[PDB]
Design an enzyme around this catalytic site. Structure first.
Site, PDB file in Angstrom:
ATOM      1  N   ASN A   1      -4.545  -7.867   2.954  1.00 41.42           N
ATOM      2  CA  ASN A   1      -5.417  -7.594   4.107  1.00 41.42           C
ATOM      3  C   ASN A   1      -6.556  -8.652   4.110  1.00 41.42           C
ATOM      4  O   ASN A   1      -7.197  -8.898   3.064  1.00 41.42           O
ATOM      5  CB  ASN A   1      -6.047  -6.214   4.026  1.00 41.42           C
ATOM      6  CG  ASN A   1      -5.168  -5.165   3.450  1.00 41.42           C
ATOM      7  OD1 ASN A   1      -4.947  -5.131   2.249  1.00 41.42           O
ATOM      8  ND2 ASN A   1      -4.727  -4.222   4.293  1.00 41.42           N
TER       9      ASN A   1
ATOM     10  N   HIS B   1       0.388   5.059  -0.155  1.00 44.48           N
ATOM     11  CA  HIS B   1      -0.804   5.781   0.198  1.00 44.48           C
ATOM     12  C   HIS B   1      -0.576   6.775   1.295  1.00 44.48           C
ATOM     13  O   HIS B   1       0.535   7.228   1.527  1.00 44.48           O
ATOM     14  CB  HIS B   1      -1.985   4.779   0.516  1.00 44.48           C
ATOM     15  CG  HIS B   1      -1.838   4.015   1.790  1.00 44.48           C
ATOM     16  ND1 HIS B   1      -0.613   3.664   2.331  1.00 44.48           N
ATOM     17  CD2 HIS B   1      -2.769   3.535   2.643  1.00 44.48           C
ATOM     18  CE1 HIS B   1      -0.806   3.009   3.460  1.00 44.48           C
ATOM     19  NE2 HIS B   1      -2.114   2.932   3.676  1.00 44.48           N
TER      20      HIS B   1
ATOM     21  N   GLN C   1       0.873  -1.175   0.000  1.00 45.23           N
ATOM     22  CA  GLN C   1       0.000   0.000   0.000  1.00 45.23           C
ATOM     23  C   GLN C   1       0.912   1.227   0.000  1.00 45.23           C
ATOM     24  O   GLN C   1       1.845   1.301   0.771  1.00 45.23           O
ATOM     25  CB  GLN C   1      -0.887  -0.025   1.219  1.00 45.23           C
ATOM     26  CG  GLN C   1      -1.884  -1.100   1.114  1.00 45.23           C
ATOM     27  CD  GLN C   1      -2.773  -1.316   2.320  1.00 45.23           C
ATOM     28  OE1 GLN C   1      -3.528  -2.312   2.353  1.00 45.23           O
ATOM     29  NE2 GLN C   1      -2.665  -0.449   3.354  1.00 45.23           N
TER      30      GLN C   1
ATOM     31  N   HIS D   1      -3.461  -8.442  11.621  1.00 44.97           N
ATOM     32  CA  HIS D   1      -4.000  -9.415  10.623  1.00 44.97           C
ATOM     33  C   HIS D   1      -3.721 -10.831  11.099  1.00 44.97           C
ATOM     34  O   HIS D   1      -3.356 -11.675  10.276  1.00 44.97           O
ATOM     35  CB  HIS D   1      -3.344  -9.183   9.244  1.00 44.97           C
ATOM     36  CG  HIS D   1      -3.752  -7.902   8.568  1.00 44.97           C
ATOM     37  ND1 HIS D   1      -3.089  -7.410   7.450  1.00 44.97           N
ATOM     38  CD2 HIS D   1      -4.752  -7.026   8.842  1.00 44.97           C
ATOM     39  CE1 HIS D   1      -3.672  -6.283   7.064  1.00 44.97           C
ATOM     40  NE2 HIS D   1      -4.677  -6.017   7.889  1.00 44.97           N
TER      41      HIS D   1
HETATM   42  C1  FAD Z   1      -7.545  -1.542  13.817  1.00 44.20           C
HETATM   43  C2  FAD Z   1      -7.286  -1.607  12.346  1.00 44.20           C
HETATM   44  C3  FAD Z   1      -7.744  -2.769  11.712  1.00 44.20           C
HETATM   45  C4  FAD Z   1      -7.607  -2.872  10.304  1.00 44.20           C
HETATM   46  C5  FAD Z   1      -7.026  -1.817   9.583  1.00 44.20           C
HETATM   47  C6  FAD Z   1      -6.388  -0.713  10.274  1.00 44.20           C
HETATM   48  C7  FAD Z   1      -6.442  -0.697  11.672  1.00 44.20           C
HETATM   49  C8  FAD Z   1      -5.715   0.482  12.363  1.00 44.20           C
HETATM   50  N1  FAD Z   1      -6.930  -1.930   8.252  1.00 44.20           N
HETATM   51  C9  FAD Z   1      -7.570  -2.921   7.562  1.00 44.20           C
HETATM   52  C10 FAD Z   1      -7.692  -2.819   6.106  1.00 44.20           C
HETATM   53  O1  FAD Z   1      -7.164  -1.809   5.555  1.00 44.20           O
HETATM   54  N2  FAD Z   1      -8.160  -3.971   5.595  1.00 44.20           N
HETATM   55  C11 FAD Z   1      -8.525  -5.113   6.259  1.00 44.20           C
HETATM   56  O2  FAD Z   1      -8.924  -6.099   5.655  1.00 44.20           O
HETATM   57  N3  FAD Z   1      -8.480  -5.132   7.609  1.00 44.20           N
HETATM   58  C12 FAD Z   1      -7.998  -4.054   8.265  1.00 44.20           C
HETATM   59  N4  FAD Z   1      -8.038  -4.010   9.613  1.00 44.20           N
HETATM   60  C13 FAD Z   1      -8.528  -5.213  10.343  1.00 44.20           C
HETATM   61  C14 FAD Z   1     -10.030  -5.388  10.346  1.00 44.20           C
HETATM   62  O3  FAD Z   1     -10.585  -4.304  11.026  1.00 44.20           O
HETATM   63  C15 FAD Z   1     -10.365  -6.702  11.080  1.00 44.20           C
HETATM   64  O4  FAD Z   1      -9.824  -7.796  10.328  1.00 44.20           O
HETATM   65  C16 FAD Z   1     -11.873  -6.942  11.143  1.00 44.20           C
HETATM   66  O5  FAD Z   1     -12.564  -5.883  11.805  1.00 44.20           O
HETATM   67  C17 FAD Z   1     -12.107  -8.272  11.830  1.00 44.20           C
HETATM   68  O6  FAD Z   1     -13.517  -8.452  11.905  1.00 44.20           O
HETATM   69  P1  FAD Z   1     -14.154  -9.428  12.979  1.00 44.20           P
HETATM   70  O7  FAD Z   1     -15.592  -9.091  12.816  1.00 44.20           O
HETATM   71  O8  FAD Z   1     -13.748 -10.871  12.892  1.00 44.20           O
HETATM   72  O9  FAD Z   1     -13.632  -8.916  14.427  1.00 44.20           O
HETATM   73  P2  FAD Z   1     -13.537  -7.506  15.213  1.00 44.20           P
HETATM   74  O10 FAD Z   1     -13.844  -6.370  14.226  1.00 44.20           O
HETATM   75  O11 FAD Z   1     -12.371  -7.545  16.042  1.00 44.20           O
HETATM   76  O12 FAD Z   1     -14.887  -7.546  16.061  1.00 44.20           O
HETATM   77  C18 FAD Z   1     -15.092  -8.524  17.029  1.00 44.20           C
HETATM   78  C19 FAD Z   1     -15.952  -8.078  18.172  1.00 44.20           C
HETATM   79  O13 FAD Z   1     -16.248  -9.108  19.084  1.00 44.20           O
HETATM   80  C20 FAD Z   1     -16.296  -8.518  20.364  1.00 44.20           C
HETATM   81  N5  FAD Z   1     -16.096  -9.429  21.463  1.00 44.20           N
HETATM   82  C21 FAD Z   1     -14.857  -9.807  21.740  1.00 44.20           C
HETATM   83  N6  FAD Z   1     -14.962 -10.705  22.732  1.00 44.20           N
HETATM   84  C22 FAD Z   1     -16.279 -10.861  23.056  1.00 44.20           C
HETATM   85  C23 FAD Z   1     -16.919 -11.594  24.026  1.00 44.20           C
HETATM   86  N7  FAD Z   1     -16.301 -12.422  24.861  1.00 44.20           N
HETATM   87  N8  FAD Z   1     -18.238 -11.463  24.114  1.00 44.20           N
HETATM   88  C24 FAD Z   1     -18.948 -10.643  23.319  1.00 44.20           C
HETATM   89  N9  FAD Z   1     -18.337  -9.917  22.380  1.00 44.20           N
HETATM   90  C25 FAD Z   1     -17.023 -10.019  22.244  1.00 44.20           C
HETATM   91  C26 FAD Z   1     -15.687  -7.149  20.330  1.00 44.20           C
HETATM   92  O14 FAD Z   1     -16.090  -6.188  21.288  1.00 44.20           O
HETATM   93  C27 FAD Z   1     -15.707  -6.813  18.869  1.00 44.20           C
HETATM   94  O15 FAD Z   1     -16.461  -5.688  18.533  1.00 44.20           O
END
Ligand code: FAD
Ligand code: FAD
EC number: 1.1.3.10
Lengths: 573, 573, 104, 52
Positions: free
Chosen positions: A548, A405, A403, A503
């Site tokens: 990603n 950018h 990337q 990731h």
């Molecule tokens: C932070 C970030 C991530 C990111 C990125 C840049 C940054 C600074 N750039 C990306 C990009 O350009 N392209 C890409 O493909 N990914 C990029 N990322 C990563 C991406 O955000 C993550 O891969 C994606 O959001 C993962 O999705 P997933 O839905 O699997 O998981 P999550 O977003 O982490 O959400 C999970 C949630 O579950 C909750 N949680 C956790 N534990 C529990 C329990 N025990 N009980 C109930 N809920 C729970 C969390 O609170 C969370 O919201």
């Protein structure tokens, strides 16, 4: 009682919701985090006018919702304290450190986000597809059939995220960088805009996609969806899934409401875990899968012995550059410039439509007007010109994602001296071989902030190809970036802390056969042996990948939901 | 058409809403910022479980919504660039700098927040009253009557914000620090808990007040308030109030919807400006009050010639300390300790209720159980013990405000080596004499990010008492802090950047007589000459004050609303 | 292991060391003042090719040491200032100050 | 340390860095005047700043 319960409200959990709410299932979703992105629930935090005006402030938003997974005990000596100040005689466990964590086998940058919408409320929205080399198989022994299945899934995932490659097409900076690279690597590599999950709304505003783009997270039925059924329950910690005796079904989900303190069990036909690669693993361990405590292959776990093994994180190299004189001068190559800026004689002109011009008329008009109206400004690039969004995608001869950018970044006072229009960020991501010995495990003694078993890593980048390629990639960034400009002091080429990339994959990995492919879920994301338990997210990805991963994980979630629709009947409304 | 229109949704604008919506006026409120604190509109961002678990991450939240008011042109030389990188031959206006701003007459830390709820979505919630020395007069020549009026107003303001002094009463750290200081300054100064706008919900959760505590910001009528009338319009820039010819009334408010792009005029009986001390001033200047461009007393403005003059900002000195051995040992002074921690013989006991104990039973039980159950931990303070919240309030012999506490802070890696329970923050705030020559003015050439006249400061701390007292205050912090512990390396006693405190006052200052008191609003916060224009906020405060000003400004807003209720009739519902 | 790569700089008439007629140095002699920029063209292109070459070559030995990532040093820190009283065959044709015997 | 202790900079431009965390009692000029051995003839952007 629900038809489907989803743990986690990030974009993967929202994919399950979009698919299954739309099919008529009665769906509940729980998230340990809270609603705090505005009235559009789970939306991208960067979509306020204020962040669109001040992108760089956004790094604060990101950092403010990233909590480190495992921090080792600090042993730095401070010896300029006053003699009156109390000090321990040892470096004791303090300040939230994990005493199980060997600092030399960590992923020190790994962090988690607990908010409605998950990390999609702050992500960069880059959504490339994986090529065959990076991608798990969905059809064995028929590559054309395999490609066909992935194309269908990726196409639907791209429509859910509103992925496009056109949002930066009239940026001078973007086209300056892209043109140079296309020309420099002619016959060797192809470049394009980074596929971004985003919709441009105006010349200065881009609406970045999020979990909310995939599913609006509003409770249903409602006037707009009067026959759908969905409830979202924020501030609820999901603790454990209850297995039957034969390990063939999940019977309930134990939850803890963090506001009331109440603890309940929720019943559902189908249980989907989409809590992220760390916290899915934690929840499974807490439910009796795998093994609690330090891994001990002397006696491997009976249930899902590959869980938490074969973990992968990408290597990431970074620099920034300051655009070359050659390239800045090329912006204005079609102009005839006479006189001295600020004086009576100064003028800038070009010949519209001339066959010898190097740039289109849209470019030259923008440049000419900027140079004439802003003679105090020594650069030919408009002030509000969007940033570059450039990539050459992973290929066998360059097995890393790129990337090129600008992303939100906290510039130091020296770096703030350099005009932002000159600056380009370079992030190159490497692929990491999955190795049995790279583990995420959970303490049987220490707990995290929510009183769940403390995650601990035992990680090193594998020897051999992964490591060699990480260095080839560093070299490649240095070589390529030099075509655009020299390095920005303070942002010289460097590796970032392991895990800072976010990731993390392979923690609950997918394959065809549990034993032969050392895996936890099949290609429907169904946990082996269990009729009604599904895991979604990057943890499923079993391959060495550099791109990603979220689009790929969304694609596997779609396939999983097609299986659920084939096998479970919605309740009568 | 509305009865009352309010520009700004911070806590002062919400005071006007609470008072006037409750009295039956049809009220509209506009904010240039957006809803982004969750479903409780304008609530404190720190009230999520996740921030209560990880306070220090909150500094990121604050920084992410503070935008610098006026940044001078950067002249730092970077001379380690590559020779291929393009560089200008001068330090030109770039990166958002204000070329009108002399770097040596700035308030470089001054910043603004544009969000629904304003700065109350991130503030520290300290709400002390001002003593007579700091406080503007509301009744002339009758000090008892004046005190009586302030007491009534402050009491109502404290009930709106839920100010209390009891939320930290069973903290070991708080009482350790407080006790030492009470004893050390016996007969000389009195100490208490900082008055905080907050409600404790559990032993580890404090619900911090905000604009939402004062008024919930929900549109009305609604089931809960079926006879009230309120609409909130976020993402709307209020540009200008239209004066009549005689400068006796406001006729309309020009607004710009930032989402649709539409520009309208809104009619109201009463116009209230609560956009903050900088942006109230900007809006007035844009409406033809005062003067645009660089101040030129050769010809002072005809309309409100004191606007933007007599500006005041507090000096702020900061350090952190690491608690003394004397004090840490005193925590466990009532204990009999035998054996060696971690070995079979170790025990910690005390005699409940004994007359010779130095601490209450609640303290000793907490200590004893912590020491016995956590023998790996060398400190006698429970892990989840709340922070100190201690002050000695401004007095003539110590004319500065003090907070001896812990607030969110970004600790460096060396500082993270020191156990958090040892650390105490010290913030001492000085009073600044109002001087005609200290100005906030607005460029007639340069515009800000919203295309409004660019704010520019001409500020220096006045010579004489203000400056002498700033040094006396620095000395006082050094002296006092030594009673508690030595300095934390990296947080040695220092002045912070001017304006970083965010207590800018006097920009639209209050007095009795426009000419004789060099002021812009009277004691009802009514702009002189105007029947229906009111300003609220710290900009009204005309005095030299050291304490945090928001409670005082809320109090003046209450008085202003009592005037409006006496003079304007609500429309029929 | 340390890596120091040194590039060549084209001599250009416009790159000057001159001496103030108003300001003096610590020994009360005319204060030296530079009017210097790295020349455009080959010198500058080669400086970047050299940076790339160091990056490529150094990778064969190991990765970078944090804090000592590839960087340009401040101009002149090298201390190999040349051409201030330059040699040639003919004073006019070779724009020079001393002949090949170093005789003015 | 030996090296640095015998290298004296040839031409140092006038310093224009702002320090704004001084005490209000400390004397400060209203301009970035020629001080601390700087060469006012020296354009900081056409220097050999490491020459010594
Ligand atoms: C932070 C970030 C991530 C990111 C990125 C840049 C940054 C600074 N750039 C990306 C990009 O350009 N392209 C890409 O493909 N990914 C990029 N990322 C990563 C991406 O955000 C993550 O891969 C994606 O959001 C993962 O999705 P997933 O839905 O699997 O998981 P999550 O977003 O982490 O959400 C999970 C949630 O579950 C909750 N949680 C956790 N534990 C529990 C329990 N025990 N009980 C109930 N809920 C729970 C969390 O609170 C969370 O919201
Ligand atoms: C940031 C902060 C502030 C703070 C604090 C700690 C920090 C890090 N600690 C405090 C404390 O411990 N005690 C205290 O008394 N104050 C403390 N503060 C300051 C406090 O937050 C402010 O004094 C207070 O919030 C001021 O209230 P006011 O309601 O007057 O102003 P505001 O909150 O800045 O909100 C004004 C709003 O108006 C909007 N706006 C601005 N311009 C326009 C235009 N043109 N049109 C429409 N709306 C406009 C803003 O968007 C804003 O929300």
């Amino acid at each position: 009682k629900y038809d489907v319960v989803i743990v986690g409200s990030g974009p993967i959990g929202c994919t399950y919701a979009r698919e299954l709410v739309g099919a008529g299932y009665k769906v509940a979703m729980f998230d340990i985090g809270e609603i705090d992105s505005g009235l559009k629930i789970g939306a991208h935090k960067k979509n306020t006018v204020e962040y669109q005006k001040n992108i760089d402030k956004f790094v604060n938003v990101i950092q403010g919702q990233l909590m480190s997974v495992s921090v080792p005990v600090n042993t730095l000596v401070v010896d300029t304290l006053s003699p009156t100040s109390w000090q321990a005689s040892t470096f004791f466990v303090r300040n939230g450190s994990n005493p199980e964590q060997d600092p030399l086998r960590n992923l020190s940058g790994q962090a988690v986000t607990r908010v409605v919408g998950g990390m999609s409320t702050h992500w960069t929205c880059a959504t490339p597809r994986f090529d065959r080399e990076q991608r798990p198989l969905l059809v064995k022994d028929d590559a054309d059939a395999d490609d066909a299945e992935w194309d269908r899934l990726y196409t639907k995932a791209e429509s859910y995220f509103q992925t496009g490659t056109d949002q930066f097409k009239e940026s001078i900076r973007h086209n300056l960088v892209l043109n140079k690279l296309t020309e420099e690597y002619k016959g060797q590599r192809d470049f394009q805009q980074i596929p971004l999950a985003a919709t441009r709304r105006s010349p200065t505003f881009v609406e970045w996609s999020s979990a909310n783009t995939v599913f609006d997270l509003q409770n249903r039925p409602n006037t707009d969806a009067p026959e759908e059924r969905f409830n979202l329950f924020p501030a609820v910690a999901c603790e454990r899934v209850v297995r039957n005796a034969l390990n063939s079904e999940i019977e309930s989900l134990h939850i803890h409401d963090l506001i009331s303190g109440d603890r309940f069990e929720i019943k559902a036909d189908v249980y989907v875990l989409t809590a992220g690669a760390v916290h899915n693993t934690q929840l499974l361990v807490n439910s009796g899968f795998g093994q609690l405590g330090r891994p001990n292959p002397a006696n491997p776990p009976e249930l899902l012995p590959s869980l938490g093994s074969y973990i992968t994180e990408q290597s990431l190299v970074f620099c920034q550059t300051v655009m070359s004189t050659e390239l800045i001068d090329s912006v204005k190559s079609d102009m005839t410039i006479r006189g001295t800026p600020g004086e009576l004689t100064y003028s800038v002109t070009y010949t519209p439509g001339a066959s010898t011009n190097k740039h289109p008329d849209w470019w030259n008009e923008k440049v000419k007007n900027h140079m004439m109206q802003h003679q105090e400004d020594p650069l030919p690039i408009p002030f509000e010109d969007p940033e570059p969004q450039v990539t050459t995608l992973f290929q066998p001869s360059h097995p890393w994602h790129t990337q090129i950018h600008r992303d939100a970044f906290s510039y130091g006072a020296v770096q703030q001296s350099i005009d932002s229009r000159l600056i380009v960020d370079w992030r190159f991501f490497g692929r990491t071989e999955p190795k049995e010995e790279n583990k995420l495990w959970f303490s049987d003694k220490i707990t995290d902030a929510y009183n769940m078993p403390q995650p601990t890593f035992d990680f090193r980048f594998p020897a051999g190809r992964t490591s060699k390629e990480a260095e080839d990639m560093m070299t490649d960034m240095c070589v390529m970036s030099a075509k655009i400009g020299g390095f920005l002091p303070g942002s010289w080429p460097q590796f970032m802390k392991p895990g800072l990339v976010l990731h993390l994959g392979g923690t609950h990995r997918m394959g065809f056969d549990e034993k032969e492919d050392n895996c936890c879920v099949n290609t429907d994301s169904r946990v082996f042996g269990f009729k009604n338990l599904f895991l979604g997210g990057c943890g499923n990805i079993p391959t060495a990948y550099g791109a990603n991963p979220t689009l790929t994980a969304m694609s596997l979630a779609i396939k999983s939901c097609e299986y659920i629709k084939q096998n479970f009947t919605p309740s009568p409304f």
